[PDB]
């Protein structure tokens, strides 16, 4: 009925903005499920290495959770 100090939509889109990208799956089961993953891989390298706004966007998007050594 009244207004909170925080809108849920702004916090929701801020969390969606600061979210880490998903880890890249690679289906070795079906070739139809394999070609989409390799197309995603080459598009990821293209938009992460070409000199445009996409490279700096993906570079800021990356977070660095390193695993420790074990004996």
């Amino acid at each position: 009925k009244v207004q909170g100090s925080v809108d849920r939509r702004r916090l929701q889109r801020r969390i969606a903005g600061l979210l880490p990208p998903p880890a890249r799956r690679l289906n070795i089961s079906r070739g139809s499920e394999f070609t989409r993953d390799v197309r995603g891989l080459v598009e990821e390298h293209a938009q992460a290495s070409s000199l445009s706004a996409a490279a700096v966007w993906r570079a800021g998007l990356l977070a660095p959770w390193r695993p420790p050594v074990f004996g």
Partner: protein, 148 residues
């Protein structure tokens, strides 16, 4: 056979807003949406003091006027809401099997519950910091019994 296991979740929460309490009677609330950028606040009062013309010859106070200022108190509140990546990596994909549809809506309910608890934590922190601001500028009763 891998059995899915369901556990009952509860949300023991009381939805309280800062306009729901009577504490907001003490506070004229504005929403300056950029308060991280403010270095300092300022508000000036210019009280002109009238006097009394007197019959006896006394040293007359020629139009006294005070100019006082009041600096703002700026303090931030920080909650630290955790969110596991296990029920976050399934938030990006789409379900196609009912086990994925179960764990996806479980992840959705988890992040929606923990998200709206951070908002409630900030509201309770807001009411806490308003109440402690009112406590910090509060003389006790036995002082204002005579100073007022």
């Amino acid at each position: 056979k891998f059995e899915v296991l369901l556990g009952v979740y509860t949300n023991a929460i009381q939805y309280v807003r800062f306009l729901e309490t009577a504490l907001a009677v003490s506070c004229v609330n504005t929403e300056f949406k950029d308060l991280s950028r403010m270095t300092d606040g300022k508000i000036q009062f210019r009280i002109s003091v009238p006097t009394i013309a007197h019959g006896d010859g006394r040293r007359p106070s020629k139009q006294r006027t005070f100019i006082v200022v009041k600096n703002c108190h700026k303090h931030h509140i920080s909650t630290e809401m955790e969110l596991s990546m296990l029920d976050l990596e399934i938030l990006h994909s789409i379900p196609e099997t009912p086990v994925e549809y179960a764990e996806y809506v479980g992840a959705v309910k988890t992040v929606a519950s923990a998200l709206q608890f951070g908002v409630d934590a900030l509201e309770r922190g807001l009411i806490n910091t308003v109440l402690s601001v009112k406590l910090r500028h509060a003389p006790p009763m036995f002082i204002l019994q005579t100073l007022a």
